[PDB]
Design an enzyme around this catalytic site. Sequence first.
Site, PDB file in Angstrom:
ATOM      1  N   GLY A 147       0.796  -1.208   0.000  1.00 40.80           N
ATOM      2  CA  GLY A 147       0.000   0.000   0.000  1.00 40.80           C
ATOM      3  C   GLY A 147       0.835   1.268   0.000  1.00 40.80           C
ATOM      4  O   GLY A 147       2.053   1.263   0.186  1.00 40.80           O
ATOM      5  N   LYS A 206       7.090  -3.095  17.398  1.00 43.86           N
ATOM      6  CA  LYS A 206       8.348  -2.379  17.290  1.00 43.86           C
ATOM      7  C   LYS A 206       8.079  -0.886  17.398  1.00 43.86           C
ATOM      8  O   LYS A 206       6.973  -0.431  17.091  1.00 43.86           O
ATOM      9  CB  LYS A 206       9.066  -2.684  15.967  1.00 43.86           C
ATOM     10  N   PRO A 207       9.064  -0.103  17.845  1.00 48.71           N
ATOM     11  CA  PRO A 207       8.840   1.348  17.966  1.00 48.71           C
ATOM     12  C   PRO A 207       8.480   2.014  16.652  1.00 48.71           C
ATOM     13  O   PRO A 207       7.797   3.045  16.655  1.00 48.71           O
ATOM     14  CB  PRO A 207      10.178   1.862  18.511  1.00 48.71           C
ATOM     15  N   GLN A 208       8.928   1.458  15.525  1.00 50.02           N
ATOM     16  CA  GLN A 208       8.543   1.999  14.227  1.00 50.02           C
ATOM     17  C   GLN A 208       7.046   1.854  13.985  1.00 50.02           C
ATOM     18  O   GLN A 208       6.441   2.695  13.311  1.00 50.02           O
ATOM     19  CB  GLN A 208       9.344   1.304  13.126  1.00 50.02           C
ATOM     20  N   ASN A 209       6.430   0.808  14.538  1.00 48.57           N
ATOM     21  CA  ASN A 209       5.007   0.566  14.341  1.00 48.57           C
ATOM     22  C   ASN A 209       4.125   1.346  15.307  1.00 48.57           C
ATOM     23  O   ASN A 209       2.902   1.347  15.136  1.00 48.57           O
ATOM     24  CB  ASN A 209       4.708  -0.929  14.472  1.00 48.57           C
ATOM     25  N   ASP A 227       6.158   8.739  14.287  1.00 45.72           N
ATOM     26  CA  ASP A 227       6.159   7.493  15.038  1.00 45.72           C
ATOM     27  C   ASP A 227       7.150   7.585  16.197  1.00 45.72           C
ATOM     28  O   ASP A 227       7.854   8.584  16.370  1.00 45.72           O
ATOM     29  CB  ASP A 227       6.484   6.311  14.119  1.00 45.72           C
ATOM     30  N   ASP A 249       4.044  -8.077  16.347  1.00 46.72           N
ATOM     31  CA  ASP A 249       4.945  -7.231  15.568  1.00 46.72           C
ATOM     32  C   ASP A 249       5.117  -5.878  16.244  1.00 46.72           C
ATOM     33  O   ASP A 249       5.045  -4.822  15.612  1.00 46.72           O
ATOM     34  CB  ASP A 249       4.433  -7.050  14.139  1.00 46.72           C
ATOM     35  N   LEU A 266      -1.377  10.748  12.823  1.00 50.55           N
ATOM     36  CA  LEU A 266      -0.382  11.145  13.808  1.00 50.55           C
ATOM     37  C   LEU A 266       0.878  11.578  13.069  1.00 50.55           C
ATOM     38  O   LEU A 266       1.280  10.940  12.091  1.00 50.55           O
ATOM     39  CB  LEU A 266      -0.072  10.001  14.780  1.00 50.55           C
ATOM     40  N   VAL A 275       0.746   5.318   1.604  1.00 47.16           N
ATOM     41  CA  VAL A 275       0.173   6.141   2.664  1.00 47.16           C
ATOM     42  C   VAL A 275       0.136   7.590   2.199  1.00 47.16           C
ATOM     43  O   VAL A 275       1.156   8.140   1.769  1.00 47.16           O
ATOM     44  CB  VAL A 275       0.970   6.002   3.970  1.00 47.16           C
TER      45      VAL A 275
HETATM   46  N1  ADP Z   1      -2.887   6.479  10.383  1.00 48.17           N
HETATM   47  C1  ADP Z   1      -1.611   6.899  10.209  1.00 48.17           C
HETATM   48  N2  ADP Z   1      -1.186   8.071  10.729  1.00 48.17           N
HETATM   49  C2  ADP Z   1       0.077   8.501  10.562  1.00 48.17           C
HETATM   50  N3  ADP Z   1       1.015   7.820   9.880  1.00 48.17           N
HETATM   51  C3  ADP Z   1       0.728   6.629   9.305  1.00 48.17           C
HETATM   52  C4  ADP Z   1      -0.634   6.090   9.440  1.00 48.17           C
HETATM   53  N4  ADP Z   1      -0.648   4.914   8.786  1.00 48.17           N
HETATM   54  C5  ADP Z   1       0.594   4.717   8.276  1.00 48.17           C
HETATM   55  N5  ADP Z   1       1.415   5.737   8.586  1.00 48.17           N
HETATM   56  C6  ADP Z   1       2.840   5.854   8.191  1.00 48.17           C
HETATM   57  O1  ADP Z   1       3.087   5.082   7.013  1.00 48.17           O
HETATM   58  C7  ADP Z   1       4.331   4.389   7.115  1.00 48.17           C
HETATM   59  C8  ADP Z   1       4.166   2.961   6.617  1.00 48.17           C
HETATM   60  O2  ADP Z   1       3.298   2.275   7.517  1.00 48.17           O
HETATM   61  P1  ADP Z   1       2.899   0.734   7.283  1.00 48.17           P
HETATM   62  O3  ADP Z   1       2.092   0.636   6.010  1.00 48.17           O
HETATM   63  O4  ADP Z   1       2.324   0.201   8.573  1.00 48.17           O
HETATM   64  O5  ADP Z   1       4.326   0.028   7.041  1.00 48.17           O
HETATM   65  P2  ADP Z   1       4.435  -1.546   6.719  1.00 48.17           P
HETATM   66  O6  ADP Z   1       3.036  -1.939   6.315  1.00 48.17           O
HETATM   67  O7  ADP Z   1       5.441  -1.622   5.598  1.00 48.17           O
HETATM   68  O8  ADP Z   1       4.915  -2.154   8.015  1.00 48.17           O
HETATM   69  C9  ADP Z   1       4.745   4.411   8.577  1.00 48.17           C
HETATM   70  O9  ADP Z   1       6.057   4.965   8.707  1.00 48.17           O
HETATM   71  C10 ADP Z   1       3.738   5.295   9.283  1.00 48.17           C
HETATM   72  O10 ADP Z   1       4.411   6.357   9.962  1.00 48.17           O
END
Ligand code: ADP
Lengths: 246, 65, 269, 290
Positions: A11, A107-110, A64, A105, A61, A13
């Site tokens: 996807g 992690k601080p990135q999530n 992260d 899953d 938001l 974003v």
């Molecule tokens: N609802 C949201 N609000 C703010 N940022 C978002 C949101 N959804 C996704 N992101 C941003 O999009 C990036 C990719 O997220 P994600 O699709 O979860 O990565 P992956 O699916 O590859 O693990 C992240 O760095 C995150 O900061």
Amino acid sequence: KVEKIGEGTYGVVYKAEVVALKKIRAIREISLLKELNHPNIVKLLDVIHTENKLYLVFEFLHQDLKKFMDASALTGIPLPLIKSYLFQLLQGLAFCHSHRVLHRDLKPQNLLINTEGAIKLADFGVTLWYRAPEILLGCKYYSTAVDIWSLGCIFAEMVTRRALFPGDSEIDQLFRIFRTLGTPDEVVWPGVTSMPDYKPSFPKWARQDFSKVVPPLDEDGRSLLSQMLHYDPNKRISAKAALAHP
Amino acid sequence: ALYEYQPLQIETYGPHVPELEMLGRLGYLNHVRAASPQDLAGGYTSSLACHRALQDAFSGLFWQP
Amino acid sequence: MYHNSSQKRHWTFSSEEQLARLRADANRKFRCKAVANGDPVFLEPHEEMTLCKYYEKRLLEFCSVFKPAMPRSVVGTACMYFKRFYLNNSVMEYHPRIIMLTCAFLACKVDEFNVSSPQFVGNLGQEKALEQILEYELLLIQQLNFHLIVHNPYRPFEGFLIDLKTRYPILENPEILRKTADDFLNRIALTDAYLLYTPSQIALTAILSSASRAGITMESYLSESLMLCLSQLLDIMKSMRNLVKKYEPPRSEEVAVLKQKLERCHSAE
Amino acid sequence: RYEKLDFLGEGQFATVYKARQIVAIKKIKLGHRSEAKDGINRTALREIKLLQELSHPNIIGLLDAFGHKSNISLVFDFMETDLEVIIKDNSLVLTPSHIKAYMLMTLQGLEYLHQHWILHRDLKPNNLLLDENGVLKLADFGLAKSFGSPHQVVTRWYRAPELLFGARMYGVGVDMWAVGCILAELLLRVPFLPGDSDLDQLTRIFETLGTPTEEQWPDMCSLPDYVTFKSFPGIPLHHIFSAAGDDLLDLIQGLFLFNPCARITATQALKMKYFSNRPGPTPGCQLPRP
Ligand SMILES: Nc1ncnc2c1ncn2[C@@H]1O[C@H](COP(=O)(O)OP(=O)(O)O)[C@@H](O)[C@H]1O
Ligand SMILES: Nc1ncnc2c1ncn2[C@@H]1O[C@H](COP(=O)(O)OP(=O)(O)O)[C@@H](O)[C@H]1O
Ligand SMILES: [Mg+2]
């Protein structure tokens, strides 16, 4: 669209009140995000089904937690802030574990953070740094203690400004866990000699006090981290029990 | 139909580079650092470093634009 | 390897006349574009060359004190990127102050010198500089014709040193030739010889110049050990020495007035 | 310039589109917000910097690398299928000549790569693309690294034991083990050592080939991520490959040697008896297509 936030493995974003739109070229994530209504988790507002692509709407938001500690590496996150973040994450995990759902899953990135000071879970559907020894040792059982282990790893990274077990490979990750928390003896972890990926020729490393593993934490915080960082999945403190922790 | 081996021919535009196997007898390896056991375990030898250095030193020495 | 790479095929020119022609063509193209968009503020090609060499020295100084430990192959690649970029483009279109930083960033990324943007900008308005490098990275990559591999003469120098230590018993201690030849290499860095001759030839002439300065002849090495052609290589080395000798550093007042003029042009357009 | 014709796939790193000579445009992803200040992705930069210096019929070529803003798109040749689909296809039959031809193409590509001191480091059946003319070409050069001057590894199913034990410095042995695993997969139509983890992969390797002693692997304890194992006897090679010949068995034994230095290289393997025996390798036109 206001801007393009980025793109992960699946996807794209976009940013567009301000919301985030995820474009997918699935149903499991929608089902997992629609059954809980909690203020400490990202809420899927609307779903748009089109023959071109599928659109998922979430709250926005700005950044992260990973970027938050990257920017605050020198400044240092104050103890009340990380304590509040950990308590909010624990509340969210307890609400998730009340239902029949597993994250696995963490992690601080999530984890996403807002301006007001609220941290919410995300991505409800490489990551060796936050893996439990049960998963590393080839155990197919997916209990709820893996989320607690990952949360403890994130907490330790936040307080120490550095990953607790920064291993590069699965074997090196297990070795780092063994050095940091001693050897998983049979008496310490019953059934440790039963997983397919346990070898009796493993090095017999000795346990060391958490005073040098996580220095700046307090005694109560160290005790909570130790309870979350337990070899035995059955002895790991649950999220509900961790919520009622001094 | 049988496949017959034929070594690749690429012009180095320089002096002939000694064979990698012969580097032991010709005495090149006495003028470098001895390989550790660790990188010897993975298959990394000082002979490869010497061969690369010699190949690069003789690469394109007799060439003009 | 160099003998089958794009640097030999595209970024090695026969003589300085071609380099002067390309720089003059770039200046003429910029002047034509400016006069078509709609005169004393313009800079002659020699002023552009002087400013380019001054900013190359600035890039040398910047990479000298860069943190963390900065290898020399990455610095050589950055300098070669700078030379290739400003051979075909005018100095007033893109300010060299940020272009040298962009070249250093691209060299660090390409040469596997793993470093992040915050670490790169901490060695220096840092946010503005980071934005400028991010914007200019694609332009710099495109200007290099997507040929981002550069062979510095340090590896051929080490190979020649090893071969001389092995097959040449007349010379006792090769280490005495390590310093001076290296110094000569630095001079060849300032000269345009990096775009005229192969790195192996550069290392060879540096070694022979160091030996000649030390007082030890090496005609036996070239004639017998290398099986050597001889006159051609000697003429190449003589041309290298002449190119090094004729190079001179710019004066302070000329550099200052050229910098002021360049700032005036960049603020005017 | 390049009108998009169809969508091919999408990975963690980049998304590929088949566009119009028919080519493949791979566009790298911007990544997460923590990877937005890094400009162009290092994987695409590595592919550009390594594919602009190699010209071999058995290596993927970078036709163009046009980009815009911070987005970069790499142009590769169009490939009909890959070797993984050939392995997993049950409708076709993999005769020994087909395996010989695939091994020959892979080894020629590896020899050319090693001559210029480049390690593929990501050798997998899905990384060996096949064009419409039946020519195998190595691809996915995002992990390729130049070797010879004194943790990105392939998946465990083809990781060499030195890589599994955590070898920082290594030669062409890792690619040799990977191509040996590819040969075993070609022969058995199944993942030869389908481990579930690194430790499980090591256990499967030592059960199928026997745990080697210091006489076969002179340096074992030197590696940092090394764990001692039981003395598994190891299944005999001719029992595993009942339909393989003696020369093919010798080639497999050389490819699977536990000593990377003693393990045969591309040059040694290419001139071995198996490739010079009868029948000759299959021409690319007659190679099977799904
Ligand atoms: N609802 C949201 N609000 C703010 N940022 C978002 C949101 N959804 C996704 N992101 C941003 O999009 C990036 C990719 O997220 P994600 O699709 O979860 O990565 P992956 O699916 O590859 O693990 C992240 O760095 C995150 O900061
Ligand atoms: N030359 C090519 N022609 C057509 N498709 C290609 C080519 N190279 C790569 N691909 C596509 O790339 C995909 C594999 O990507 P993958 O290696 O999984 O990405 P990652 O390395 O990020 O995991 C395949 O589905 C294939 O269709
Ligand atoms: Mg692939």
